[PDB]
Amino acid sequence: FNRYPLIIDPSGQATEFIMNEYKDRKITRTSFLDDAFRKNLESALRFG
Amino acid sequence: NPLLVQDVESYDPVLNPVLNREVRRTGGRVLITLGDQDIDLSPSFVIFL
């Protein structure tokens, strides 16, 4: 991808595939509704 | 990078967390809170006064 992907996964298989694929890089699952989204985004921007 | 600091009689209290090794490990990174900003502490860092 060039632009960051938007995944449409009604079955939920794609999200677990993403978690498994990027587990070695310490991937974190968050949401827009969560109030911790700011700090998660800020940490992702500064530390990968 | 190794660091050598002279004139320790004018010691800056900003070095207190660094000297105390007050690190915060999170997500594979080692964070040191120098002042008000977080810094990834590389394991090769060393300071001599």
Tab-separated table of C-alpha atoms in Angstrom:
chain	number	residue	atom	x	y	z
A	1	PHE	CA	0.000	0.000	0.000
A	2	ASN	CA	0.907	3.659	-0.479
A	3	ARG	CA	-1.930	5.220	1.497
A	4	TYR	CA	-2.633	3.611	4.844
A	5	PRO	CA	-5.164	0.803	4.328
A	6	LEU	CA	-8.785	0.732	5.434
A	7	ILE	CA	-9.783	-2.866	6.161
A	8	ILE	CA	-13.414	-3.960	5.814
A	9	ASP	CA	-13.613	-7.277	7.692
A	10	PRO	CA	-17.149	-8.267	8.736
A	11	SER	CA	-15.915	-11.804	9.472
A	12	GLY	CA	-13.056	-10.566	11.670
A	13	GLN	CA	-10.412	-12.747	10.012
A	14	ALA	CA	-8.451	-9.827	8.551
A	15	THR	CA	-7.938	-8.141	11.923
A	16	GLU	CA	-6.542	-11.326	13.483
A	17	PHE	CA	-4.339	-11.819	10.417
A	18	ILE	CA	-3.030	-8.286	10.968
A	19	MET	CA	-2.371	-8.977	14.662
A	20	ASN	CA	-0.483	-12.179	13.830
A	21	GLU	CA	1.503	-10.600	10.987
A	22	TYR	CA	2.771	-7.570	12.937
A	23	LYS	CA	3.049	-9.281	16.333
A	24	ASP	CA	6.842	-9.409	15.986
A	25	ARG	CA	6.860	-5.595	15.695
A	26	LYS	CA	4.701	-5.132	18.836
A	27	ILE	CA	1.450	-4.131	17.152
A	28	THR	CA	-1.225	-2.536	19.344
A	29	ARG	CA	-4.981	-2.714	18.734
A	30	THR	CA	-6.925	0.435	19.612
A	31	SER	CA	-10.100	2.272	18.584
A	32	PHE	CA	-11.267	5.775	17.744
A	33	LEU	CA	-13.783	5.700	20.607
A	34	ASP	CA	-11.151	4.899	23.242
A	35	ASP	CA	-9.809	7.866	25.201
A	36	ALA	CA	-6.318	6.310	25.071
A	37	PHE	CA	-6.157	6.785	21.290
A	38	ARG	CA	-4.183	10.032	21.659
A	39	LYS	CA	-1.330	8.497	23.650
A	40	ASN	CA	-1.277	5.345	21.506
A	41	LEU	CA	-1.002	7.449	18.334
A	42	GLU	CA	1.654	9.680	19.893
A	43	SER	CA	3.722	6.674	20.996
A	44	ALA	CA	3.341	5.083	17.558
A	45	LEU	CA	4.489	8.287	15.858
A	46	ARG	CA	7.627	8.591	17.981
A	47	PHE	CA	8.652	4.923	18.506
A	48	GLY	CA	7.434	2.963	15.476
B	1	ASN	CA	27.324	7.862	22.672
B	2	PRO	CA	29.809	7.987	25.561
B	3	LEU	CA	29.818	11.360	27.300
B	4	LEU	CA	32.414	13.029	29.522
B	5	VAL	CA	31.180	16.012	31.539
B	6	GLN	CA	33.523	18.391	33.357
B	7	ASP	CA	32.935	20.903	36.167
B	8	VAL	CA	30.745	18.569	38.219
B	9	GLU	CA	30.795	21.113	41.060
B	10	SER	CA	28.103	22.870	38.976
B	11	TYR	CA	26.110	19.639	38.711
B	12	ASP	CA	22.821	19.960	36.837
B	13	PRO	CA	19.938	18.147	38.605
B	14	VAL	CA	18.602	17.196	35.165
B	15	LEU	CA	20.974	14.202	35.350
B	16	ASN	CA	19.232	12.717	38.411
B	17	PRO	CA	16.980	10.259	36.492
B	18	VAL	CA	19.933	9.333	34.268
B	19	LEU	CA	22.208	8.644	37.244
B	20	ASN	CA	19.422	6.806	39.092
B	21	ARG	CA	18.567	4.705	35.997
B	22	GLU	CA	14.888	5.643	36.352
B	23	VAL	CA	13.934	3.968	33.080
B	24	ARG	CA	10.488	2.928	31.839
B	25	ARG	CA	10.419	-0.121	29.573
B	26	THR	CA	7.428	-0.201	27.230
B	27	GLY	CA	7.037	-1.911	23.868
B	28	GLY	CA	10.682	-2.941	23.573
B	29	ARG	CA	11.895	0.620	24.175
B	30	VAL	CA	13.750	1.933	27.224
B	31	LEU	CA	12.385	5.386	28.066
B	32	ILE	CA	14.211	7.965	30.194
B	33	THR	CA	12.281	11.071	31.262
B	34	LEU	CA	14.917	13.789	30.928
B	35	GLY	CA	13.045	16.907	32.002
B	36	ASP	CA	9.605	16.833	30.387
B	37	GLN	CA	10.224	14.762	27.230
B	38	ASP	CA	10.708	11.020	26.801
B	39	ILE	CA	13.959	9.734	25.297
B	40	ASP	CA	14.815	6.259	24.013
B	41	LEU	CA	17.823	5.272	26.129
B	42	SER	CA	20.274	3.333	23.981
B	43	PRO	CA	22.080	0.585	25.947
B	44	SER	CA	25.488	1.837	24.749
B	45	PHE	CA	25.107	5.190	26.527
B	46	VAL	CA	27.624	5.941	29.280
B	47	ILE	CA	28.446	9.164	31.135
B	48	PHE	CA	31.587	10.094	33.077
B	49	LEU	CA	31.721	13.061	35.451
